[PDB]
Amino acid sequence: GSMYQLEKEPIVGAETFYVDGAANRETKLGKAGYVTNRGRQKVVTLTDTTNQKTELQAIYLALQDSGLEVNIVTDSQYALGIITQWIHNWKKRGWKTPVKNVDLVNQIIEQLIKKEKVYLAWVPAHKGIGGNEQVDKLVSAGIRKV
Numbered sequence: 073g074s075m076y077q078l079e080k081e082p083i084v085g086a087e088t089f090y091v092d093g094a095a096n097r098e099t100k101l102g103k104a105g106y107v108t109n110r111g112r113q114k115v116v117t118l119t120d121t122t123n124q125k126t127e128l129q130a131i132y133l134a135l136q137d138s139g140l141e142v143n144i145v146t147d148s149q150y151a152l153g154i155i156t157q158w159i160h161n162w163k164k165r166g167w168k169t170p171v172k173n174v175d176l177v178n179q180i181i182e183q184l185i186k187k188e189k190v191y192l193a194w195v196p197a198h199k200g201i202g203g204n205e206q207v208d209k210l211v212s213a214g215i216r217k218v
């Protein structure tokens with residue numbers, strides 16, 4: 073019983089957003105974006121950012137640009153946990169909100185509860201030709217070598 077329930081399995085039929093972000097610590101330059109299984113993609117370049125911010129920013133773009141039912145695959149355990157924990161503990165007993173990234177996370181949650189159904193799952197970064205590998209390349213170009 074929370075302020076929303078994420079889906080326990082992928083939403084059959086819904087479009088899938090493979091999100092990723094990448095940042096460079098020395099310059100605080102970074103990129104966030106997505107590729108989808110309906111031939112959609114988007115990459116944005118960011119300044120003054122961090123790796124965790126860019127993974128969160130990517131999810132925000134995916135929620136922003138999608139319909140009411142959406143599948144999101146991320147490789148960030150941080151991004152998944154912080155969003156899931158926020159949903160499960162909202163208005164609950166021992167909730168101290170995070171300090172870091174709190175503005176972006178609040179922005180994401182706001183987008184999130186507007187949705188009808190959201191499936192959000194983690195996969196380890198891996199090589200190959202699937203979705204996570206494609207967006208990883210896009211957000212990595214000029215930010216870090218792979």
Ligand SMILES: O=C(Oc1ccc(CO)cc1)c1ccc([N+](=O)[O-])s1
Pocket residue numbers: 092093094095096123147148149197207208209211212215216217218
């Ligand atoms: O997109 C990715 O490639 C890069 C490459 C370089 C940098 C620079 O730090 C950041 C991301 C991801 C790698 C690892 C991820 N993961 O959640 O472990 S996403």
Ligand SMILES: [Mn+2]
Pocket residue numbers: 092093127147148
């Ligand atoms: Mn990543």
Ligand SMILES: [Mn+2]
Pocket residue numbers: 092093147197204208
């Ligand atoms: Mn990646």
Ligand SMILES: [Zn+2]
Pocket residue numbers: 119120
């Ligand atoms: Zn700057």
Ligand SMILES: [Zn+2]
Pocket residue numbers: 140141188
């Ligand atoms: Zn629907």
